[PDB]
From a paper:
FLT3 is a transmembrane receptor that is expressed on the surface of early hematopoietic progenitor cells and dendritic cells. Mature wild-type FL belongs to the structural family of short-chain four-helical bundle cytokines and consequently exhibits a noncovalently linked homodimeric structure, in which the two protomers interact head to head. The binding of a dimeric cytokine to an RTK-III induces receptor dimerization that results in transactivation of the auto-inhibited tyrosine kinase domains and the activation of downstream signaling pathways. However, structural studies have shown that the hematopoietic receptor FLT3, a class III RTK, does not appear to engage in such receptor–receptor contacts, despite its efficient dimerization by dimeric FLT3 ligand (FL).
It was found that a Leu27Asp substitution at the dimer interface of the cytokine led to a stable monomeric cytokine (FLL27D) without abrogation of receptor binding. By mutating Leu27 to an aspartate, we hypothesized that the entropic penalty for burying a charged residue in the hydrophobic interior of the second protomer would be detrimental for any dimerization event to occur. We concluded that these experimentally determined values are in excellent agreement with their theoretical molecular weights and confirmed that FLL27D is indeed a monomeric species in solution. With only an excess of FLL27D detected, this shift indicates that despite its monomeric nature, FLL27D was still able to recruit all available receptor molecules into complex formation. The molecular species has a molecular mass of 70 kDa as determined by SEC-MALLS, which is well below that of an FL-mediated receptor complex (152 kDa) and therefore allowed us to infer that the apparent FLL27D–FLT3 complex consists of one molecule of FLL27D and one molecule of FLT3. Given the observation that FLL27D still binds FLT3, it comes as no surprise that the absence of structural deviation from FLWT remains valid for residues 6–13, which are all key players in the largest interaction site of the FL–FLT3 epitope. Likewise, no combination of symmetry relations can reconstitute the head-to-head dimer resembling FLWT, despite the fact that the loop containing Asp27 is located near tightly packed crystal lattice contacts.
Residue numbers in the entry:
A (entry chain B): -3 to 134
B (entry chain A): 4 to 134
């Protein structure tokens, strides 16, 4: 269920063993290299920073479902399912300090896979309420 | 980087407004956060960046938007005729919506329109950041 009023923590792992294969499959079969963004000045925390990058990536995945054709929906949703859990927490709006770089979906997917590798052993073990506010580097 | 005939038509603002108002689907875009505050070179720098977004949006917008997008592209495509250089590493960006990008674009064209056929703009080919 949702975690919108309570602590941002997970009793069952939302990240499956085969996230890397799912992400590599979408990246290999994409029909075009859609223009997206990544944050450029997030505070360099491994765990919170992974969640922050997944919050942003998850929004891109939903956006792409609205512009990619039929044939991409299953591949896109497979990646969405590995990262959709962040929507269950009350992440707050990004701060005005946040900066971005425009890049391509392939780079975003690579970054996403890297965050899941970092988060997977931790995801069900921690209270991540401390991460709901995105932070920038000075 | 100079123009013998004005590449900006009288009705740019109506064309941009039409795209903004009837945009069928929003898609995040970027604008620069720390460009040097030059009115004329700065307008050109913002249009170089906006014109690349117009081309990107054609690759994600549906059939019905292509005419609206191209009508704006034609108003700002003249920047592709100059040898603008790759942005410097200092340049940073914010994520925003197409409406904001379009309002910024219209504002640059109002500033540039009286100057565009008179001036040599070679001094603008390198984008500059604020201190």
């Amino acid at each position: 269920g949702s975690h919108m009023t309570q602590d941002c923590s997970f009793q069952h792992s939302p990240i499956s063993s085969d996230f890397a294969v799912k992400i590599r499959e979408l990246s290999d079969y994409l029909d075009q290299d859609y223009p997206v963004t990544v944050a450029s000045n997030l505070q360099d925390e491994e765990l919170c920073g992974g969640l922050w990058r997944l919050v942003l990536a998850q929004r891109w995945m939903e956006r792409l479902k609205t512009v990619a054709g039929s044939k991409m929906q299953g591949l896109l949703e497979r990646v969405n399912t590995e990262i959709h859990f962040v929507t269950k927490c009350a992440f707050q709006p990004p701060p005005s300090c946040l900066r971005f770089v425009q890049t391509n979906i392939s780079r975003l997917l690579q970054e996403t896979s890297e965050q899941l590798v970092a988060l997977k052993p931790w995801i069900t073990r921690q209270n991540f309420s401390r991460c709901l506010e995105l932070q920038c580097q000075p």
